Amino acid sequence: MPLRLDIKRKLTARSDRVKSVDLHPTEPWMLASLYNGSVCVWNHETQTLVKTFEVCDLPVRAAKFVARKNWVVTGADDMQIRVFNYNTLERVHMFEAHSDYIRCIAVHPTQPFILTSSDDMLIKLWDWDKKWSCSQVFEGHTHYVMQIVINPKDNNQFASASLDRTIKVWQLGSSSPNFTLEGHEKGVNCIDYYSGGDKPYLISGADDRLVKIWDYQNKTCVQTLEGHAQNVSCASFHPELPIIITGSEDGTVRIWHSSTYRLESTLNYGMERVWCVASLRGSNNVALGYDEGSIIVKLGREEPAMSMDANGKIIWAKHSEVQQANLKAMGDTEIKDGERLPLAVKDMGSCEIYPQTIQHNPNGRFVVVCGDGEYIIYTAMALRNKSFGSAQEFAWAHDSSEYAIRESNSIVKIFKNFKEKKSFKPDFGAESIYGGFLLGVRSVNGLAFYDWENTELIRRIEIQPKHIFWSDSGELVCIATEESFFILKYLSEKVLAAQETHEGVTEDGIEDAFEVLGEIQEIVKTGLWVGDCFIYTSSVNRLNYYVGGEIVTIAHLDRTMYLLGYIPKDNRLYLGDKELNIVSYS
Amino acid sequence: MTAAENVCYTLINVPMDSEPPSEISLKNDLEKGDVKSKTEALKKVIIMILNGEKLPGLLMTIIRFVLPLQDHTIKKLLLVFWEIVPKTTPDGRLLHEMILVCDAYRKDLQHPNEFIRGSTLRFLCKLKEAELLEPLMPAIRACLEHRHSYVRRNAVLAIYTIYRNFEHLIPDAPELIHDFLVNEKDASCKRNAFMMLIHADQDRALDYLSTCIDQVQTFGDILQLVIVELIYKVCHANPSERARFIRCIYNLLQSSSPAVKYEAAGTLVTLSSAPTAIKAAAQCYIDLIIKESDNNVKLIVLDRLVELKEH
Amino acid sequence: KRNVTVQPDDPISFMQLTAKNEMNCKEDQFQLSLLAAMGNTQRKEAADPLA
């Protein structure tokens, strides 16, 4: 099924030919090594060039961050490795590493080791704690060693790709390769490891225009990806998403599904040939290097697919697997605020679609999983499929038996007891739908609220909402935008009176239907009502609640957390992070 | 005055490695040398004078054999030479030879090369001899109407320094620069004209600002900084004007330029002691400390928060 | 060092009569800073200018 990845451009950096890209683990930085002998550091949040290192007049083919030492390590065609402090811009060290061009640098994640590969057919291991001594030389390639990658699951192993048409897997401490993979008809330019624990896969790209996926335990080719029109210059597994990213001298980046091996998307930004790809663990940002510059793309939503029922059952998706945790199973353990909860996780099975969103219905009996342009409604206890269909968006009504789906930008369908009740076309189209007491429909002109039963327009609001949160009483509604949020009071009695008398009904609905209680200049990421208190997480990683025009901070969060729910019995608010760590606050 | 008490615009500590050229050698190279030899001889003469050597015998040699040259490098080196050479007798009278140099300045102010005019105008900002400036005043005024912004911006600075030091030579300078500021389009020329009015005639600077006050957010950062400096000086001298400018300074806290934000926050604290104004300025400083990556900025802006706390 | 002995002829500050917004006129710190940087600031305390 086609993975609907929302692909957003975060950075566009025009420069000379980019030969390597890397992402900083903690800072919003992209490293780009240029063909003109300069290395640039871009901030992808501010879209600014932060740092520039003039390395040499010759191409810099490899550059890597060493975040733990505040270093940038560069390998240039002058056969020199240069180490720079990225804070002081000072050159810490410089040495001749190889007798020919340096093609790739791999930094060991925990040990003081750098692996370098060269056109001299050698791979060398350097120990920086031993004054950059060469600790080992790996011999056995018969042509240029284009790329090296350390195994993320076993840091003592690395793979090398060579123009000799071979892939060799090496072990630190062995002068001989553990094995050689053969099967490319031309030189191999790129290699990467699958990061997930479930599969022993390698990916390689070659001048034969093929991308091959290998099982490194069985030493077999699992799959061949065909479709690039020129040499494949880069191939990688995404660390978080079930996708493969391949780049080619054809100027295209292709995104493939990592389990079905189908082409999902083809990106062409008009920057000529693609040379390099970098991804970061725990991030959906992907850096792409081209002949005319570099681009950062954000792939999909950063929000984890997770939902909590009113009883404290949490369901989340870990890739395609659905897992359940139960807060009631913790027993009398002293829970501290902001600490990770020790939850017993139960595997519920794999979903047929890639879950982008998971939501319980208001009574917790059913769970909807939305992904790949489909929705599947499961029973919350046993994940039995109860209903399925095609939808772009899904929204539950306040009534646990009703839901709406957005089938297209012009058609909204309302379902009751899993049967289609009504289909209507909103006057200005439907760009998004929101559930709750009223059916919210976002259009290009603003927000319209409709009655779930009659599909009558209650009120139009000139605002572009991102989220709409209703109170359990149905009297209060939060409309969150990209810049601010508004608290509105819904005057249900005035709406009923206006529907009976037809007084005050206009083309924009009932004028008296909503009263504005407040406007707050904070960005809501996630929100929940508890009585007349609106609890939310801000863009600045604060946990706040709004009550009576006052904002009260509950806690300062050290990372982006997502609101799951509030359990009144436990006096605790539950939050989840991107890593599916659940925390609670009193 | 001794060379140590004199105004020093230039210091050059070159090790005189080679035998210090004799005054006779320098004189021969200046008289008979090619343009390169004359250029090197003139550089050596400038360095020797800067290091405290008195070469009065070379003055007329430079006037006769170097001053009439049209070489751009020699023209610029001559401006540095005229900056440092003694122009007066010990009794404070102008040297008779300087009359010949005054005609050369007039020719350079009328030169077809705009950079020679601009460099000569910049040199005239350092001249302290009123008798040399008086015959140049018509040529300096004509440079305000020059087609190149490079000439106009330096002509404003020359008029400002002449007015400041010798008001009697150009008593209409504040009016002339106000009319220039209203008609000017170049941002650097506008800044230099506005800067002159801040120091020479604050009321005319305020009148100009009052016509543009609603547009200040759309101005370039350089002009915004000089406007913030005027608002500070005016509100310091006349506390009743604070009420007029608070709204303008608060809008400048939202400037795209971090330099303008910093100066606007510092000025806002001087305009208002109200808790809301101090909170807005303090938040602007905190936001600058968090967003700015440079530790120099972080430390200095932290010291502004410490100064705020002392109240 | 800040507790100057109040003299009989010193002004009586009536806080009830002072408007709450009278910022003390600080000296122009920019002009003082410029004079200090040029070395033209006579140090206030030590060189009695009438010495």
Partner: peptide, 24 residues
């Protein structure tokens, strides 16, 4: 006749109204 949310300059007006409430 759509409900207009957000007027440009309201933040400056709110700051000025706060300063006036503080006696400036």
């Amino acid at each position: 006749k759509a409900l207009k949310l957000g007027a440009k300059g309201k933040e400056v007006d709110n700051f000025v109204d706060k300063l006036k409430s503080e006696g400036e």
